[PDB]
Ligand binder design. Structure first.
Ligand SMILES: CC(=O)N[C@H]1[C@@H](O[C@H]2[C@@H](O)[C@@H](CO)O[C@H](O)[C@@H]2O[C@@H]2O[C@@H](C)[C@@H](O)[C@@H](O)[C@@H]2O)O[C@H](CO)[C@H](O)[C@@H]1O
Ligand SMILES: CC(=O)N[C@H]1[C@@H](O[C@H]2[C@@H](O)[C@@H](CO)O[C@H](O)[C@@H]2O[C@@H]2O[C@@H](C)[C@@H](O)[C@@H](O)[C@@H]2O)O[C@H](CO)[C@H](O)[C@@H]1O
Lengths: 332, 332
């Protein structure tokens, strides 16, 4: 039975999203719909992504590393490779396990891009595994075309590149026709200055692989993401309730759900056209949330994209299987 | 009932340890005993440490930052503060949530220490939260005395310092009366060259707070840690089965156990002098594992310190409450 996929602790503070690993504190309705495949599982035990249902560090053994200009100190370092070259990843060769499903936003000069996935890492020597220790930095990672020096974000894994580009200067740049990449899988969002940006990634920034089904709205039932507070590069100390604004990151599933779906096949429990529904009971009201066979969650928010805070959530109660065309109750 | 605290997926690939967050693939017996408090919960809903049962980041808002060298570029950066000053941490002011419970080993000149906890991060500007973006590096973090100029590791939180020192040079050093620290909570171990070191941390390197109970041997029943493969700085690409040797990190609990123990109290199901016992069934043989009220796990390995691989583990089955003086069966 799918009832055990969503329980009270997942949404009252013990849950974490499947993209950022952040503590789930809100639901984010998406009236346009969206797609996600990386670290996302369906109810047929399957993913279209390239990541396991845990937070693996990111390691690719064969890319091109460079910096611009003749000076080698305090320089922007860029690493890139084609998609489909993560030949050591057993899930998919699209990209390394853990590599973020977001477009790599271009930047040059002194500018820092807004809204990219940033991780801390370094380039390493393919002869022996040793780091090029002057290349440690915060790197924006994502999918792109035009690397190395005309980067534009991409939304597809087909015929594109994976890129890491340092958002700040490294101590000692490396020009290596072949070099490895190592980045931790805990991300922050790129920002400049003190302001928070929109919830990240926005729908049109998510990269998906061929075959990924979309989460489309069905009437007033719209797909939802799970939101937590994430760090941002421009005000690294900002957290929940910062006077400079609170930054949210979203994922398509709680990671505990992803993990359960990767270990058990639910195809006999739910079939296309149905949701499994739970009731979320708050201090003053309730709403229903539905899960479809593609692993996406839905709520009946209609055209609203206002975040639903979970602070006053009391409990989650299973309701059962219902048609996906029946409007999910929204009584907040 | 504690039975649900250990299930088959925790030990067959879906579990992670509570210090490194690494996939659990082995058990490490500790015949001489050990103590752990950080990110360790007991069966009375309580921790003696300073971290939540999750991994995000380490943030301290008030330390001293400095560097050494004839210039300010490609220099070693040190940050320190006293224990007991993390007053924004609701669990404990001992240290920031996520700060590693390991001693900081001193180093100078070219060489770096073997066996320290290393994380990626930076120091930041307390006036506005912005990073000192030239201070990004891999930093050894731990507890110490003698910071900044004569760092030596400590194993107590009483009267000591928390320190971060970059293992490689930063792009632009900072000498600041006050600076913040930001480091990601998933660490690697410090090494030089290709070799792995001993499992990390060894018992004599673990930092505990006053009141932390020890895990002592009881007859042939000895405490055990949970081991997974971790990265090491000297060969950052090495993983499981590297030709250069495999590096293990240990934690006192699977993080799923820590999380469950933090959400519900088990004091009525187990009392001092008792274990809750499970049987681990392998393709050839079995062993029993026990959990005590202080949250430590035990096996009947007697004097043996050999790691036990979980490759051939088939399943975990609960046995029930037993006296801790009864020898746990070990049939491998
Ligand atoms: C107009 C408004 O929104 N007032 C709120 C708000 O005020 C904050 C906010 O504007 C942030 C933006 O970065 O900057 C300050 O923190 C500001 O605080 C208010 O103004 C300053 C100049 C001081 O007078 C301060 O005491 C005052 O609170 O947020 C605050 C709470 O954080 C209040 O809710 C205001 O009504
Ligand atoms: C003496 C011994 O135990 N040899 C093993 C070992 O050999 C490896 C190992 O020594 C690593 C250490 O970093 O370096 C090489 O990979 C070495 O490989 C062996 O020797 C080289 C010179 C080549 O001849 C190579 O083909 C050969 O395998 O590990 C390997 C498995 O990786 C074997 O198990 C050896 O018997």
């Amino acid at each position: 039975s799918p009832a055990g996929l969503l329980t009270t602790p997942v949404l009252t503070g013990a849950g974490s999203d499947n993209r950022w690993g952040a503590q789930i504190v809100a639901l984010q309705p998406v009236p346009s719909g969206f797609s996600t495949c990386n670290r996302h599982w369906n109810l047929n035990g399957s993913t279209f992504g390239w990541s396991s249902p845990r937070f693996s560090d990111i390691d690719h053994p064969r890319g091109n590393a460079s910096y611009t200009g003749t000076g080698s100190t305090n320089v922007i370092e860029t690493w890139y490779a084609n998609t489909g070259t993560a030949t050591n990843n057993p899930i998919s060769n699209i990209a390394p396990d853990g590599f973020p499903d977001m477009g790599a936003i271009g930047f040059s000069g002194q500018t820092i891009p807004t809204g990219g996935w940033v991780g801390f890492g370094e380039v390493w020597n393919v002869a022996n595994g040793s780091p090029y220790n002057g290349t440690v930095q915060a790197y924006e990672l994502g999918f792109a075309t035009g690397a190395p020096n005309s980067i534009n974000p991409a939304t597809t894994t087909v015929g594109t590149q994976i890129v890491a580009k340092s958002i700040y200067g490294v101590a000692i740049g490396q020009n290596q026709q072949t070099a490895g990449l190592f980045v931790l899988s805990t991300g922050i969002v790129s920002t400049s200055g003190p302001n928070a940006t929109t919830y990240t990634p926005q729908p049109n920034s998510i990269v998906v692989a061929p075959g990924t089904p979309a989460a489309a709205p069905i009437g007033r039932n719209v797909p939802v993401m799970f939101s937590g507070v994430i760090r941002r590069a421009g005000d690294i100390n900002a957290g929940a309730g910062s006077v400079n604004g609170t930054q949210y990151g979203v994922g398509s599933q709680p990671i505990s759900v992803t993990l359960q779906l990767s270990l058990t096949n639910y195809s006999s429990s739910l079939q296309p056209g149905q949701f499994f529904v739970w009731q979320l009971n708050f201090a003053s009201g309730f709403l229903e949330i539905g899960l479809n066979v593609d692993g996406y969650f839905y709520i009946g928010a209609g055209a609203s994209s206002n975040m639903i805070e979970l602070t006053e959530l009391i409990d989650v109660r299973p309701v059962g299987v219902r048609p996906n065309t029946s409007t999910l109750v929204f009584n907040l």
